[PDB]
């Protein structure tokens, strides 16, 4: 390391912390830059160099990182807690954390070389014919392909490639990550990675939720499963079974939207799909983020500023280039230079996912001007809500209206229902999904599912929490868990079931800030500064503040709460509540080991 990016001598009392603090931001911002701009350039461009400078640069980052923790833990280990200012207590108590800094110099090359790799595999992996890529390709088979044979050859093919190599390396990944999480004091790296919650009942109190919610998705489940039947009969769907794994509209089942015209209760009414009109009228990329940025500076808030358009990538590149094409938000911790990286494609709910990025980018704006540890979300959950937050009330008939892609407008009863059941397609459908996988990898990291176990214990937790089924046979040699970018990319996904939840008590409290007086699931913040100001006080102050006082402030609680979800979907939870009794449902899955069979001449077709 650099002698220049050494910490010099403090005195051991919260007088030399503050110099001490002072002094370590200073180099931090210059070995962070380093460090995302090699991401940046690799992840825009994978090539076998571009990997071994962003190797170079993650070592030289551990080599920091261990230089500044020893030396935090050797002046204020026993002290720091006591600290009189909250912003160094939390300073001091990030920089003592070294993690694969931990490592001895051949487990760390081993450590950085794996998250290279696994990255390589997910990203470049194609499904080839008797060749298709994620990003368009099978997210669009997935989404609009209506017959079982192509489907499945997506789905089959898309885990066996992605999958079946990725374990032996993430094996490896795992233990070395305990090994070095263990020497901060972590019992697994799990236990670390929850402890960013700072709550001693979160498993418990994230439990309880989804007790109060599987009702809802229960429902949907029945009702959606019925539909399915109709259109690719008895053969292939079991009323009292799982629903196989590939009809749903997305590759990993998470979130149904895509199937909305396959469900939807009132079909004569006017198509809630805006994609067509958002083709017709010829809109691009760039329509997409200049549409996004308007809503935020109508609140208020800031503009994206000139670096964002000059530096981000928005479309897929068309050289041929391999990229990373999973949408990804960009803070380069020098307060100036901030990115969104997004293959965009021309939907309604790619329109979404602009507004989810932007999001992370607005947050990276507010809390430019904090010291470089505190420049994060008061829990991980806040990150993931906001854009969100915009983006129902952009989703609301009315709202499209206002924007020229929505022309009939109505406010019967029927039309309540279809848009909430769309939303529920989106938002109900992914809790079970947002609350398993990290059930999966902290049962991984802590050694109740060893290697011999992978697929057996994700298939478990999919079928009891999701109710599905893989449509093809499966065992230890793959690895489904790894066909989910999050995993091999090492993202903890529990921040997306806590952000789910959240953004519903945000809406509600923006939408009483607001004025307004109608149903909530009718609101929209559009125009509101009154509401601009309350969401960007949350913005501004980092991680400064415990996210239980932060919350407090913001809706009057001091914890999560289900009840403003609950009272959104009200409606349509009773109308599907009562139309499944009436059809004579069987609400859940009883023959657990159902799969269904393979399609004739399966695969040739
Ligand atoms: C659409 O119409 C509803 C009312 O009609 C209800 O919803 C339709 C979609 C149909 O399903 C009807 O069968 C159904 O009965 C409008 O909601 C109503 O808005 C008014 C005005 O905001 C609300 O009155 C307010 O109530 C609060 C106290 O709760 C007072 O403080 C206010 O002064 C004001 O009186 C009313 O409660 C609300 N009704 C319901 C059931 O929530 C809705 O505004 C309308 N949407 C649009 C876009 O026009
Ligand atoms: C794990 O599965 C693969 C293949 O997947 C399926 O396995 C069975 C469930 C079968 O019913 C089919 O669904 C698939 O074959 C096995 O590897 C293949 O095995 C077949 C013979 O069954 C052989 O012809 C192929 O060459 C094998 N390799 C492939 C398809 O790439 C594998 O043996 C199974 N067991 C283990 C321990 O990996
Ligand atoms: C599309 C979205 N991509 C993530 C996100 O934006 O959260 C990307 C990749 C993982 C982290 N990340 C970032 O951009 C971080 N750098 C932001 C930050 O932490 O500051 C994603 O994965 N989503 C959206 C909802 C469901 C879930 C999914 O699709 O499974
Ligand atoms: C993608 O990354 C590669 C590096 O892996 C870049 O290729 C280098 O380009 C410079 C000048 O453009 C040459 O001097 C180097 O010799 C190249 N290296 C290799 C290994 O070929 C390439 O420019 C990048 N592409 C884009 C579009 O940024
Ligand atoms: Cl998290
Ligand atoms: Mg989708
Ligand atoms: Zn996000």
């Not at 392909?145 to 490639?161: D, I, K, P, Q, V």
């Not at 952009?394 to 009863?413: A, F, M, Q, Y």
């Not at 415990?546 to 349509?572: R, T």
Request: glycine residues 6%.
């Amino acid at each position: 390391l650099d002698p220049g990016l050494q910490p010099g001598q403090f005195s051991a009392d919260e007088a030399g912390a503050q110099l001490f603090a002072q002094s370590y931001q200073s180099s931090a911002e210059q070995v962070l830059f380093q460090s995302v701009a090699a991401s940046w350039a690799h992840d825009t461009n994978i090539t076998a160099e571009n990997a071994r400078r962003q190797e170079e640069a993650a070592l030289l980052s551990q080599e920091f990182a261990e230089a500044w923790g020893q030396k935090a833990k050797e002046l204020y280990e026993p002290i720091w807690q006591q600290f009189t200012d909250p912003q160094l207590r939390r300073i001091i108590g990030a920089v003592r954390t070294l993690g694969s800094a931990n490592l001895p110099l051949a487990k760390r090359q081993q450590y950085n070389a794996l998250l290279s790799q696994m990255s390589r595999i997910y990203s470049t992996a194609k499904v080839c014919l008797p060749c298709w890529s994620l990003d368009p390709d099978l997210t669009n088979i997935l989404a609009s392909s209506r017959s079982y044979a192509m489907l499945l050859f997506a789905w089959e093919g898309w885990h066996n490639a992605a999958g079946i190599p990725l374990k032996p390396l993430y094996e490896d990944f795992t233990a070395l990550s305990n090994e070095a999480y263990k020497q901060d004091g972590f019992t697994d790296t799990g236990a670390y990675w929850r402890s960013w919650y700072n709550s001693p009942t979160f498993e418990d109190d994230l439990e309880h939720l989804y007790q109060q919610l599987e009702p809802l998705y229960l429902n949907l489940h029945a009702f959606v499963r019925r539909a399915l039947h109709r259109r690719y009969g008895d053969r292939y769907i079991n009323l009292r079974g799982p629903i196989p794994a590939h009809l749903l509209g997305d590759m990993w089942a998470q979130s149904w939207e895509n199937i909305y015209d396959m469900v939807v209760p009132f079909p004569d009414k006017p198509n809630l799909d805006v994609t067509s009109t958002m083709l017709q009228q010829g809109w691009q990329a760039t329509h997409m983020f200049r549409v996004a940025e308007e809503f935020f500076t109508s609140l208020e808030l800031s503009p994206m500023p000139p670096e964002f358009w000059e530096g981000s990538m928005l479309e897929k590149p068309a050289d041929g280039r391999e990229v990373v094409c999973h949408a990804s938000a960009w803070d380069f911790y020098n307060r100036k230079d901030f990115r969104i990286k997004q293959c965009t494609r021309v939907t309604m709910d790619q329109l979404s996912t602009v507004h989810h990025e932007m999001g992370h980018i607005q947050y990276y704006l507010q809390y430019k001007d904090l010291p470089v540890s505190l420049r994060r979300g008061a829990n991980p959950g806040f990150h993931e809500a906001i854009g969100d937050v915009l983006a129902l009330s952009v989703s609301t008939p009315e709202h499209l209206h206002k924007i020229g892609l929505l022309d009939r407008v109505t406010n019967d009863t029927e039309s309540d229902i279809n848009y909430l059941l769309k939303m529920a397609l989106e938002k109900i459908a992914f809790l079970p999904f947002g609350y398993l996988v990290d059930q999966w990898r902290w049962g991984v990291f802590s050694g109740r599912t060893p290697p011999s176990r992978y697929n057996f214990d994700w298939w478990y937790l999919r079928t009891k929490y999701q109710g599905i089924c893989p449509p093809v046979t499966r065992n230890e040699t793959h690895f489904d868990a790894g066909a989910k970018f999050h995993v091999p990319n090492v993202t903890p996904y529990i921040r997306y079931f806590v952000s789910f939840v959240l953004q519903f008590q945000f809406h509600e409290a923006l939408c009483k800030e607001a004025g307004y007086e109608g149903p909530l699931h009718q609101c929209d913040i559009y125009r509101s500064t009154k509401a601009g100001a309350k969401l960007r006080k949350v913005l501004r102050a980092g991680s400064s503040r415990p996210w239980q006082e932060v919350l407090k402030d913001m809706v009057g609680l001091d914890a999560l709460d289900a009840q403003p979800l609950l009272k959104y979907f009200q409606l349509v939870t009773q109308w599907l509540q009562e139309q499944n009794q009436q059809n004579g449902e069987v609400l859940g899955w009883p023959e657990y080991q159902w799969h269904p069979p393979l399609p004739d001449n399966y695969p040739e077709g």
